[PDB]
Design a protein around this ligand. Structure first.
Ligand code: HEM
Ligand code: HEM
Lengths: 108, 108
């Protein structure tokens, strides 16, 4: 695990294009198919208020940081087997760096 | 040649990230390393006012459309051998569709 800073501009459009369909990142943002991601960095998995996670997510108790996030986004079901997140993953590291750069400034 | 509509949102960040370094797309936009692209679609190659093209660009007399543009962006030097445009190309069609979707609404 070794993430590098990418384009937030580029990361924000990855977000709109691959994650918005199921999540919000804003404070005061609502849970939708996926939980609201505001303040995810440094939190553990399964703790968004009012959201119904899988036993799988909960139990993994992942601490969310930028390198976890990157391994996570590679192949979600592989990272947390039993997850309901129906996303196949961001194959290219460059894509992942971008998206995690934006999430890092946007979810805070 | 068969281009399909992509994300303009996504195409605009490709632009910022791969083309802005050398071009503008705005009307009233200045020539920089590369010529200003405002109104490129339907024009022929080598005709931006006040810009010093290569003999290569000029002579190809490419008519600029969305499918030309896409073959062009794949491998620029291959499309116009003798070109000074020091860009290696957009390998992924998806990337090219996005970028040409945005250019199409932005350069008009
Ligand atoms: C690349 C875009 C995405 C990002 C960055 C992202 C990020 C995340 C993260 C970090 C979690 C863990 C939540 C936590 O532990 O608080 C999560 C969960 C979840 N996401 Fe995504 N996700 C993305 C795409 C999607 C998409 C497209 C969907 C809908 C098809 C989706 C649906 C879900 C669901 C249902 C959960 C909860 C899983 C469970 O409870 O087992 N996500 N997402
Ligand atoms: C994917 C981003 C880019 C796009 C969409 C793009 C588009 C184009 C187009 C359509 C032309 C033909 C001009 C005409 O016939 O009027 C051109 C020429 C040119 N571009 Fe790019 N370009 C891109 C990236 C770059 C970059 C990064 C550079 C600088 C390193 C650059 C430098 C040039 C130059 C110097 C020319 C003129 C070539 C010649 O006279 O032989 N372009 N560009």
């Amino acid at each position: 695990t070794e993430f590098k800073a990418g384009s937030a501009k580029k990361g924000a459009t990855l977000f709109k294009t691959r994650c918005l369909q199921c999540h919000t990142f804003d404070q005061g943002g609502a849970n939708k198919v996926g939980p609201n991601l505001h303040g995810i960095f440094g939190r553990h998995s399964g703790q968004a208020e009012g959201y119904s996670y899988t036993d799988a997510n909960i139990k993994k108790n992942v601490l969310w940081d930028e390198n976890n996030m990157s391994e996570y986004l590679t192949n979600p079901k592989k990272y947390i087997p039993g997850t309901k997140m129906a996303f196949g993953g961001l194959k290219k590291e460059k894509d992942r760096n971008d998206l995690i750069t934006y999430l890092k400034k946007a979810c805070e």
